[PDB]
């Protein structure tokens, strides 16, 4: 059984008319899930608010204050260019981190085979002490501390196949070995950061523009499976950001659903070998409403297989 994390509160966060990081993005794949069906095979439940704790074991204590400091009563409240908080934003962020951590205790628990979080703002770009272009705080990080510092798990694993690299789970754990960061990323591309001065936990593959499902495939086959066989992660963590797709207005790659369905099927294999088969999973970015929908909806249904 797959796990379906989820907030009306999610909702609620936007940062402009003109933002494409946006609440409809959240209710294209509820309508994909219905069209598919595929809705059916997945059980809902609703995303929890993160505690204080569960943010500091990522994040800095003054990170965490000053976005509580910056929530605005009315109006919007600048973060960086294209990120701001409006005064539901807050209530948001905890929901979305809220939702990784209750997934992760009811993988570890049994509860669920694996699961997804449906989730709005993304996580991964949010640095310990740095929120910046959409992440507040960076869910997929958090969850996986949780599961390292509470559930006592010696070794996990985190992918990340989002376009934009994620600079905020580089930032976390880049002396943390009990973490391995497999990844791909198009470069050079906002954020610019990743390709460089890589510790050895970092698996962070650069991608060139225009690239299609084919050069990713063989990226994945031929460099992240030798790294995850011989770490043997415990469990699976999950940046599933759905930009790279051909028809993502900001991105420029050329991934197709069937491209999210295998790399789904990859991690789904690497978790059955080392990790009892424990993923979960949290939306990144992803900005075409047709083609987030497909993707996450084959994301999903090669969760539930
Ligand atoms: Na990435
Ligand atoms: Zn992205």
Not at 97 to 116: L, S, W
Not at 265 to 285: F, T
Request: aromatic content about 8%.
């Amino acid at each position: 059984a797959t796990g379906f994390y989820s907030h009306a509160d999610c909702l609620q966060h936007e940062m402009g008319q003109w933002h494409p990081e946006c609440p409809a993005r959240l209710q294209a794949i509820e309508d994909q899930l219905i069209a598919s069906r595929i809705g059916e095979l997945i059980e809902r439940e609703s995303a929890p608010l993160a505690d204080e704790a569960a943010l500091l074991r990522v994040h800095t204590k003054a990170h965490v204050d000053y976005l509580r400091a910056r929530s605005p009563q009315s109006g919007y409240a600048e973060i960086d260019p294209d990120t701001s908080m409006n005064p539901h934003t807050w209530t948001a962020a905890l929901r979305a981190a809220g939702a990784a951590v209750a997934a992760t205790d009811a993988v570890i628990e049994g509860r669920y085979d694996n699961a997804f979080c449906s989730v709005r703002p993304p996580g991964h770009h949010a640095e310990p002490a740095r929120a910046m272009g959409f992440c507040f705080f960076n869910n997929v990080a958090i969850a996986a501390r949780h599961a390292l510092e509470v559930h006592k798990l010696e070794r996990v694993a985190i992918i990340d196949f989002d376009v934009h690299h994620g600079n905020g789970t580089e930032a976390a754990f880049s002396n943390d070995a009990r973490v391995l960061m497999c990844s791909i990323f198009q470069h050079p591309f906002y954020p610019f950061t990743g390709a460089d001065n890589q510790a050895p936990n970092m698996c962070n593959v650069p991608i060139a523009a225009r690239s299609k499902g084919m050069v990713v495939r063989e990226a994945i086959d031929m460099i992240w499976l030798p790294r995850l066989d011989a770490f043997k992660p415990q469990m699976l963590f999950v940046s599933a950001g759905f930009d790279a797709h051909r028809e993502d207005d900001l991105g420029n790659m050329a991934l197709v659903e069937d491209d999210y369905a295998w790399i789904t099927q990859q991690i789904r294999l690497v978790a059955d070998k080392y990790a009892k088969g424990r993923i979960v999973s949290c939306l990144e970015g992803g900005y075409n409403l047709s083609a987030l929908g497909r993707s996450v909806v084959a994301h999903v249904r090669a969760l539930a297989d």
